[PDB]
Coordinates of C-alpha atoms in Angstrom, one line a residue:
Chain A
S11 CA 0.0 0.0 0.0
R12 CA 1.1 3.4 -1.0
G13 CA -0.1 6.8 -2.1
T14 CA 0.6 9.6 -4.5
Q15 CA -0.2 13.3 -4.7
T16 CA 0.1 15.5 -7.7
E17 CA 2.1 18.7 -7.5
Chain B
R72 CA -20.1 18.9 0.4
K73 CA -23.0 18.0 -2.0
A74 CA -22.7 14.2 -2.9
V75 CA -23.5 13.3 -6.5
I76 CA -23.1 9.7 -7.5
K77 CA -22.1 9.4 -11.1
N78 CA -21.4 5.6 -11.6
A79 CA -22.0 2.7 -9.2
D80 CA -21.9 -1.1 -9.4
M81 CA -22.5 -1.5 -5.7
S82 CA -25.2 -2.1 -3.2
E83 CA -27.3 0.9 -2.0
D84 CA -25.9 0.5 1.7
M85 CA -22.3 0.3 0.5
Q86 CA -22.8 3.4 -1.7
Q87 CA -24.1 5.3 1.3
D88 CA -21.2 4.1 3.4
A89 CA -18.7 5.2 0.7
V90 CA -20.3 8.7 0.8
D91 CA -20.3 8.7 4.6
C92 CA -16.7 7.6 4.8
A93 CA -15.6 10.2 2.2
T94 CA -17.4 12.9 4.0
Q95 CA -15.6 12.0 7.2
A96 CA -12.3 11.9 5.3
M97 CA -12.9 15.4 3.9
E98 CA -13.7 16.7 7.4
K99 CA -10.4 15.4 8.7
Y100 CA -8.0 16.0 5.8
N101 CA -7.2 18.6 3.2
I102 CA -4.6 16.6 1.2
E103 CA -6.1 14.4 -1.5
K104 CA -3.7 11.5 -0.9
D105 CA -4.7 11.5 2.8
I106 CA -8.4 11.6 2.1
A107 CA -7.9 8.6 -0.3
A108 CA -5.9 6.7 2.2
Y109 CA -8.6 7.1 4.9
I110 CA -11.3 5.8 2.6
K111 CA -9.2 2.9 1.3
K112 CA -8.2 1.8 4.8
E113 CA -11.7 1.9 6.1
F114 CA -13.1 -0.1 3.2
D115 CA -10.4 -2.7 3.5
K116 CA -11.2 -3.1 7.2
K117 CA -15.1 -3.1 6.8
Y118 CA -15.4 -5.0 3.5
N119 CA -12.1 -6.9 3.2
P120 CA -9.2 -6.1 1.0
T121 CA -8.2 -5.0 -1.6
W122 CA -9.6 -1.5 -2.3
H123 CA -8.1 1.4 -4.2
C124 CA -9.1 5.1 -4.0
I125 CA -8.5 8.1 -6.1
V126 CA -9.5 11.6 -5.0
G127 CA -9.1 14.7 -7.2
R128 CA -10.3 17.5 -9.2
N129 CA -8.8 16.6 -12.6
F130 CA -8.2 13.0 -13.7
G131 CA -9.4 10.2 -16.0
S132 CA -9.2 6.6 -15.1
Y133 CA -9.5 3.1 -16.7
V134 CA -9.7 0.3 -14.2
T135 CA -11.1 -3.2 -13.7
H136 CA -13.2 -3.9 -10.7
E137 CA -14.9 -6.9 -9.0
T138 CA -18.7 -7.1 -9.5
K139 CA -20.6 -5.0 -7.1
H140 CA -17.5 -3.1 -5.9
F141 CA -17.2 0.2 -7.9
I142 CA -18.3 3.7 -7.2
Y143 CA -17.5 7.1 -8.8
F144 CA -18.9 10.2 -7.1
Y145 CA -18.4 13.8 -6.3
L146 CA -18.4 15.7 -3.1
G147 CA -18.5 19.3 -4.4
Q148 CA -16.0 19.6 -7.2
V149 CA -13.8 16.7 -5.8
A150 CA -14.2 13.3 -7.6
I151 CA -13.8 10.1 -5.7
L152 CA -13.1 6.7 -7.4
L153 CA -13.3 3.7 -5.1
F154 CA -13.2 0.1 -6.2
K155 CA -12.1 -3.4 -5.4
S156 CA -9.6 -5.4 -7.4
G157 CA -7.6 -8.1 -5.6
Chain C
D120 CA 5.4 18.7 -23.8
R121 CA 5.9 15.1 -22.9
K122 CA 9.2 15.0 -21.1
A123 CA 9.2 12.1 -18.7
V124 CA 9.9 12.3 -14.9
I125 CA 9.6 9.2 -12.8
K126 CA 8.2 10.1 -9.3
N127 CA 8.0 6.7 -7.7
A128 CA 8.4 3.2 -8.9
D129 CA 8.4 -0.4 -7.8
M130 CA 9.1 -1.8 -11.2
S131 CA 12.0 -3.0 -13.3
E132 CA 13.9 -0.4 -15.3
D133 CA 12.9 -1.9 -18.6
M134 CA 9.2 -2.0 -17.6
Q135 CA 9.4 1.6 -16.5
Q136 CA 10.7 2.6 -19.9
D137 CA 8.0 0.6 -21.6
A138 CA 5.4 2.5 -19.4
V139 CA 6.8 5.8 -20.5
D140 CA 6.9 4.8 -24.2
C141 CA 3.3 3.5 -23.9
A142 CA 2.1 6.7 -22.3
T143 CA 3.9 8.8 -24.9
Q144 CA 2.1 6.9 -27.7
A145 CA -1.2 7.3 -25.8
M146 CA -0.8 11.0 -25.6
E147 CA 0.1 11.3 -29.2
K148 CA -3.2 9.5 -30.1
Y149 CA -5.7 10.6 -27.5
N150 CA -6.8 14.0 -26.2
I151 CA -8.8 12.9 -23.2
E152 CA -7.2 11.6 -19.9
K153 CA -9.6 8.7 -19.6
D154 CA -8.7 7.5 -23.1
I155 CA -5.0 7.9 -22.5
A156 CA -5.5 5.8 -19.3
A157 CA -7.4 3.2 -21.2
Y158 CA -4.7 2.8 -23.9
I159 CA -2.0 2.3 -21.3
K160 CA -4.1 -0.1 -19.2
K161 CA -5.1 -2.2 -22.1
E162 CA -1.6 -2.4 -23.5
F163 CA -0.2 -3.5 -20.1
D164 CA -2.9 -6.1 -19.6
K165 CA -1.9 -7.5 -23.0
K166 CA 1.8 -7.5 -22.6
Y167 CA 2.2 -8.2 -18.9
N168 CA -1.1 -10.0 -18.1
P169 CA -4.1 -8.6 -16.3
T170 CA -5.1 -6.8 -14.1
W171 CA -3.7 -3.2 -14.5
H172 CA -5.3 0.1 -13.6
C173 CA -4.4 3.5 -14.8
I174 CA -5.1 7.1 -13.7
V175 CA -4.1 10.1 -15.8
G176 CA -4.5 13.6 -14.5
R177 CA -3.3 17.0 -13.3
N178 CA -4.9 17.0 -9.8
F179 CA -5.4 13.8 -7.8
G180 CA -4.2 11.8 -4.9
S181 CA -4.3 8.1 -4.6
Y182 CA -4.0 5.3 -2.1
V183 CA -3.7 1.9 -3.7
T184 CA -2.3 -1.6 -3.2
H185 CA -0.1 -3.1 -5.8
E186 CA 1.6 -6.3 -6.7
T187 CA 5.3 -6.4 -6.0
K188 CA 7.3 -4.9 -8.8
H189 CA 4.2 -3.6 -10.7
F190 CA 3.8 0.1 -9.7
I191 CA 4.8 3.3 -11.4
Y192 CA 3.9 6.9 -10.9
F193 CA 5.4 9.4 -13.3
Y194 CA 4.8 12.7 -15.2
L195 CA 4.8 13.3 -18.9
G196 CA 4.9 17.0 -19.2
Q197 CA 2.4 18.4 -16.8
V198 CA 0.2 15.2 -16.6
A199 CA 0.7 12.6 -13.8
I200 CA 0.2 8.9 -14.6
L201 CA -0.3 6.2 -12.1
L202 CA -0.1 2.6 -13.4
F203 CA -0.3 -0.5 -11.3
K204 CA -1.3 -4.1 -11.1
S205 CA -3.7 -5.5 -8.6
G206 CA -5.8 -8.6 -9.5
Chain D
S47 CA -13.2 -2.6 -17.2
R48 CA -14.4 0.9 -17.4
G49 CA -13.4 4.5 -17.3
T50 CA -14.2 7.9 -15.7
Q51 CA -13.4 11.4 -16.6
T52 CA -13.7 14.6 -14.4
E53 CA -15.6 17.3 -16.1

């Protein structure tokens, strides 16, 4: 499990 | 904010729980990743793994979901994609 | 503007390159983020077996669970692409 | 398999 976030 | 369900292959009760869970997430967090994480983690716990969640104002998706486990909805101008696969 | 920048990966280097090349072709062909995503997902299902999922966009966060060695998150120009296998 | 697109 892991996440991302746009700039 | 105002919940508008766009697509759903999901029971009525689970749809409402998705909305409720997202609403709680948006109360707690500002960061999209963190809203997504809350919703995913709650759904894994309540309805078994494996869920995936996307929260954002600008995106397109193409995914494959298990039957009866897909919802796409807005709270205000923020779109939420939540589905099971795995 | 389609310069590639890898943000996070759990993927072989050659598969990362293939993902970039696939997304580049997708963006040459398709204007709409959903359709870009669909091209990439479908090509990865075909080449690397199902089940892949793809998000393409300028503003989003995610939290997902992937299979070991099958996750990438990258930009092409100003568009972010998340591509991963689960199922 | 299916897609979504923000408006």
